[PDB]
Design an enzyme around this catalytic site. Sequence first.
Site, PDB file in Angstrom:
ATOM      1  N   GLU A 118       0.859  -1.022   0.497  1.00  0.00           N
ATOM      2  CA  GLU A 118       0.084  -0.018   0.276  1.00  0.00           C
ATOM      3  C   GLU A 118       0.765   0.853  -0.014  1.00  0.00           C
ATOM      4  O   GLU A 118       0.389   2.247  -0.102  1.00  0.00           O
ATOM      5  CB  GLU A 118      -1.250  -0.404   1.252  1.00  0.00           C
ATOM      6  CG  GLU A 118      -2.127  -1.090   1.030  1.00  0.00           C
ATOM      7  CD  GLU A 118      -2.987  -0.970  -0.076  1.00  0.00           C
ATOM      8  OE1 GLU A 118      -3.326   0.346  -0.585  1.00  0.00           O
ATOM      9  OE2 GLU A 118      -4.266  -2.021  -0.476  1.00  0.00           O
ATOM     10  N   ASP A 127      -6.681   9.139  -5.541  1.00  0.00           N
ATOM     11  CA  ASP A 127      -6.297   8.198  -6.675  1.00  0.00           C
ATOM     12  C   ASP A 127      -7.119   8.602  -7.758  1.00  0.00           C
ATOM     13  O   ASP A 127      -7.487   8.732  -8.285  1.00  0.00           O
ATOM     14  CB  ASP A 127      -5.694   7.386  -5.932  1.00  0.00           C
ATOM     15  CG  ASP A 127      -4.958   6.123  -6.016  1.00  0.00           C
ATOM     16  OD1 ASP A 127      -4.293   6.496  -7.071  1.00  0.00           O
ATOM     17  OD2 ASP A 127      -4.827   5.163  -5.480  1.00  0.00           O
ATOM     18  N   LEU A 139      -8.217   5.017   2.293  1.00  0.00           N
ATOM     19  CA  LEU A 139      -9.400   5.754   1.607  1.00  0.00           C
ATOM     20  C   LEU A 139     -10.809   6.189   1.903  1.00  0.00           C
ATOM     21  O   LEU A 139     -10.949   6.292   2.762  1.00  0.00           O
ATOM     22  CB  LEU A 139     -10.043   4.598   0.126  1.00  0.00           C
ATOM     23  CG  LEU A 139      -9.318   4.361  -0.521  1.00  0.00           C
ATOM     24  CD1 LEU A 139      -8.153   3.424  -0.706  1.00  0.00           C
ATOM     25  CD2 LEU A 139     -10.391   3.023  -1.689  1.00  0.00           C
ATOM     26  N   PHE A 211      -8.000  -5.835   2.339  1.00  0.00           N
ATOM     27  CA  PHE A 211      -7.655  -4.907   1.967  1.00  0.00           C
ATOM     28  C   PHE A 211      -7.525  -3.208   0.887  1.00  0.00           C
ATOM     29  O   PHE A 211      -7.995  -2.345   0.990  1.00  0.00           O
ATOM     30  CB  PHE A 211      -6.267  -4.238   3.455  1.00  0.00           C
ATOM     31  CG  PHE A 211      -5.760  -3.545   3.994  1.00  0.00           C
ATOM     32  CD1 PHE A 211      -5.277  -2.170   3.203  1.00  0.00           C
ATOM     33  CD2 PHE A 211      -6.643  -3.170   4.740  1.00  0.00           C
ATOM     34  CE1 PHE A 211      -5.301  -1.513   3.017  1.00  0.00           C
ATOM     35  CE2 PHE A 211      -5.854  -1.619   5.868  1.00  0.00           C
ATOM     36  CZ  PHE A 211      -5.549  -0.812   4.368  1.00  0.00           C
ATOM     37  N   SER A 224     -13.082 -20.014  -6.454  1.00  0.00           N
ATOM     38  CA  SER A 224     -11.550 -19.688  -5.586  1.00  0.00           C
ATOM     39  C   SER A 224     -11.306 -19.582  -4.050  1.00  0.00           C
ATOM     40  O   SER A 224     -10.625 -20.554  -3.241  1.00  0.00           O
ATOM     41  CB  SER A 224     -10.375 -18.330  -6.403  1.00  0.00           C
ATOM     42  OG  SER A 224      -9.969 -18.276  -7.099  1.00  0.00           O
ATOM     43  N   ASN A 239      -6.439 -20.508 -10.723  1.00  0.00           N
ATOM     44  CA  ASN A 239      -7.913 -19.930 -10.930  1.00  0.00           C
ATOM     45  C   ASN A 239      -7.578 -18.201 -10.464  1.00  0.00           C
ATOM     46  O   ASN A 239      -8.510 -17.406 -11.362  1.00  0.00           O
ATOM     47  CB  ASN A 239      -8.734 -20.340 -10.291  1.00  0.00           C
ATOM     48  CG  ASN A 239      -9.799 -20.001 -10.036  1.00  0.00           C
ATOM     49  OD1 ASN A 239     -10.760 -19.042  -9.406  1.00  0.00           O
ATOM     50  ND2 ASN A 239     -10.656 -20.488 -11.294  1.00  0.00           N
TER      51      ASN A 239
END
EC number: 3.2.1.17
Length: 423
Positions: A118, A127, A139, A211, A224, A239
Amino acid sequence: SPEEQLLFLYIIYTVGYALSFSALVIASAILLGFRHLHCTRNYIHLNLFASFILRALSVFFKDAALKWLSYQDSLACRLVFLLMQYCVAANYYWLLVEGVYLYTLLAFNIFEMLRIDEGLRLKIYKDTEGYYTIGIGHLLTKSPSLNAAKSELDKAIGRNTNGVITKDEAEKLFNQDVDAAVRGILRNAKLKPVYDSLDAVRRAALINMVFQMGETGVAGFTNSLRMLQQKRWDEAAVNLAKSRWYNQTPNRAKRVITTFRTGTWDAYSEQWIFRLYVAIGWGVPLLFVVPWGIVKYLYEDEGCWTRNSNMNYWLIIRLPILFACIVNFLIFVRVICIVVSKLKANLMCKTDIAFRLAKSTLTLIPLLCTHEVIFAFVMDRFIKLFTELSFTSFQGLMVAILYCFVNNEVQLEFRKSWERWRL
Ligand SMILES: CC1(C)CC([C@@H](Nc2ccc(-n3cnc(C(F)(F)F)c3)nc2)c2ccc(C(=O)NCCC(=O)O)cc2)C1
């Protein structure tokens, strides 16, 4: 009987290195044979095994030279003895990096994983997506208003923002976000069962996705998540590549997918660190062994330098090993404080690699480094001290046991291989 005593110990010594050599070559074959075992942790083992294998080769070569001026006077004996001295220092230093690796492994976690992916922002930034962000991937809102974004941040920090937020304030918000991530997962019907089944490493990989994307976002990977719960890592790895996630942010996804596939932090490791271990394990021994060899050839040369009883020439081979042993015990103690902390705080289960690797490494350190420390400055009951030759011989066998034969990952490979044979 005097002669009977010296012959009996010669047997247990040679069978000690015979059992060790075999076990280490077999163990090293296992780590190399199965593809799933190819990780930095096992590569460090392979170098530690080699130092034990070479040591055994010295013992067999010395013994094999007894068959056909005496062997004590020959130069071949001094070379085989110099190789042996090299292997011994290599054992102690590859044991050092084995401790250093373990220590760093206990120090890495999700917080360190996310700080890499990050990044860190000091000032508010709009962004690519339209979202205002700051700190470590925090965010705020998509609302196209820097005025309202600063105010939205002011409420979520406590004090007035202005725009610049300190490193400490970011770490505070970072903890908030990660705690809010795990609460999301455990409050999700489709994420709790898989998270509870994942190991601490693969849990961090699951937290990593939440996250970035979100609780309800990663829950979409129905395909998955199922095969992750079923311990089928490799099928899920391919996958996850067929995703919108993988194509949008490829560098980050490949790191997370590797973490899922392997259950290690290899995708976050720097390549130069393992080259610094190989410089310690094989490099540093060379730095004190060869000057020992040179002085014992110019200034004390008498019977393969066995009569090492004169001057400072003993100290140049015993002080670097003592140094490696003191630090090994300092790591021993530090690691124990860390493990009992992580266990008490439910940060770690006894099922995790970090704990199982500590379970083996914490065993080898006092096993291999105790003697050197106890008799630190003693140059040199007979029968009783003849027993040191028994432990030093079996040493390689025990390393093969603790770092291979009882390892849970290798046992999975044998059962998984046996399963393929039937089906
Ligand atoms: C030779 C013996 C008689 C001694 C050996 C035994 N030694 C050992 C056992 C447990 C703890 N221990 C528990 N809690 C703490 C604490 F305090 F938190 F640090 C330490 N410490 C030391 C051992 C047992 C089990 C393993 C093991 O399964 N290895 C495989 C794991 C791997 O390599 O992948 C290894 C060693 C067996």
